[PDB]
Ligand binder design. Structure first.
Ligand SMILES: [Zn+2]
Ligand SMILES: [Zn+2]
Ligand SMILES: [Zn+2]
Ligand SMILES: [Zn+2]
Lengths: 78, 78
């Protein structure tokens, strides 16, 4: 149904938005500090001296737990 | 259908997960440091001496821009 398709798309897009913008594989779990952009996994974040979104200097990387990381989700990556 | 109900429930819960766990009004936009739990708006986070998830002392609150903002915008209606 249209209803199921649209809902499935919204869920798909949310899950994709939780993936690292560099490797597109690992979940985002790192915040660039001070700027606050939260777009990389730890391994990809480690290779950046400036934020890829805003180009602010990265003073340090803070580990984070995205609030949408839930066992409710099936978080398959093809 | 059962699947449509299932998707609605997942998405409803994910929407709540993107909103502050205290005030339930504002998108999460802060991380407790050092622990990394990312569950409150800055306003609520500022008033907490210990993490509401893990009870770690809060040394600092870091502003964060969650990568799931677009998804939250598109869940105003589920
Ligand atoms: Zn990565
Ligand atoms: Zn930035
Ligand atoms: Zn709040
Ligand atoms: Zn914590």
């Amino acid at each position: 149904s249209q209803q199921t398709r649209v809902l499935q798309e919204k869920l798909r897009k949310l899950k994709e938005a939780m993936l690292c913008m560099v490797c597109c594989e690992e979940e985002i779990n790192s915040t660039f500090c001070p700027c606050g952009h939260t777009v990389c996994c730890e391994s990809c974040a480690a290779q950046l001296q400036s934020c890829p979104v805003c180009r602010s200097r990265v003073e340090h990387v803070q580990h984070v737990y995205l609030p949408t990381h839930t066992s409710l989700l099936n978080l398959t990556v093809i």
